[PDB]
Amino acid sequence: SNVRVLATDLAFPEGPVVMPDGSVVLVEIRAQQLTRVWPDGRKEVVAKVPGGPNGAALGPDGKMYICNNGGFGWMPGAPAPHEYIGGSIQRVDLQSGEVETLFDKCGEHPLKGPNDLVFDKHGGLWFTDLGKRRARDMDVGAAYYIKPGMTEITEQVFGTLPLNGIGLSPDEATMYAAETPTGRLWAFDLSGPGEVKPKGKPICGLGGYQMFDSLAVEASGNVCVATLVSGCISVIAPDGTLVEQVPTGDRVTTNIAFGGPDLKTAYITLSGKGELIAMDWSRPGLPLNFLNK
Ligand SMILES: C[C@H]1CCC(O)(O)O1
Ligand SMILES: [Ca+2]
Ligand code: NA
Secondary structure: OOEEEEEOOOOOEEEEEEOOOOOEEEEEOOOOEEEEEOOOOOEEEEEEOOOOEEEEEEOOOOOEEEEEOOOOEOOOEOOOHHHOOOOEEEEEOOOOOOEEEEEOEEOOEEOOOEEEEEEOOOOOEEEEEOOOEOOOOEOOEEEEEEOOOOOOEEEEEEEEOOEEEEEEOOOOOEEEEEEOOOOEEEEEEEEEOOEEOOOOEEEEEOOOOOEEEEEEEEOOOOEEEEEEOOOEEEEEOOOOOEEEEEEOOOOOEEEEEEEOHHHOEEEEEEOOOOEEEEEEOOOOEOOOOOOOO
């Protein structure tokens, strides 16, 4: 595990997407932008994304899909009314910077705080909703699936505590969602693309005072979850076994993504230190649809 700092002075980095050339496109939630970090050290702003760009994934159209949580109040906190503009799913042209809003509601219900997302092999899009905190109450968590072609959005999970990281198993027959305040990883069986069958179960619950953020899946099927408070990556086997915890040096470790040769480099956002780092990983990551395969 040779650790290297790839970029600093990032304004709450999140949603890293590691390109084939080893460049990283990621979100800066606090600076409300999508940023490109190159291996020669240089950085460029790809697009301004007003609100709270929170997670990213490259889509089948070659555009970068964004979970926009609508904005926080700044370490993030509950958004004062004016700092919140509504949650949405958006799309950014990585060549022009054009931002288009795709969904801001499901049925008659506005999206609250979209957080992270993952494409299935047909181009369908899974995403989590962390909800928003208000003065005296908070939204429940949820997970949604947008049908291939961006034709329809559906609610698949609803009524958990806030949900954050999301991924698919290698065979894409299981969707994983990380429940933030409990440090529990939930697994949901899929009867087919975009459809949970009964709705799921927690396969791992960490002890102590540990919370979960975003995640990335390994080719082995292990789920690698950014772990807040204790500041590490928690590697969880498909059967729920805690395989290992890799310290990162930041209590606000928020996301991980695999790239580099054989997808054996982990790219991690340390959102407390404002850093993007890279770390050797003993096992290869799961190739993401429309990015790595
Ligand atoms: C504190 C929450 C909001 C952004 C995050 O990284 O998903 O975690
Ligand atoms: Ca997240
Ligand atoms: Na990730």
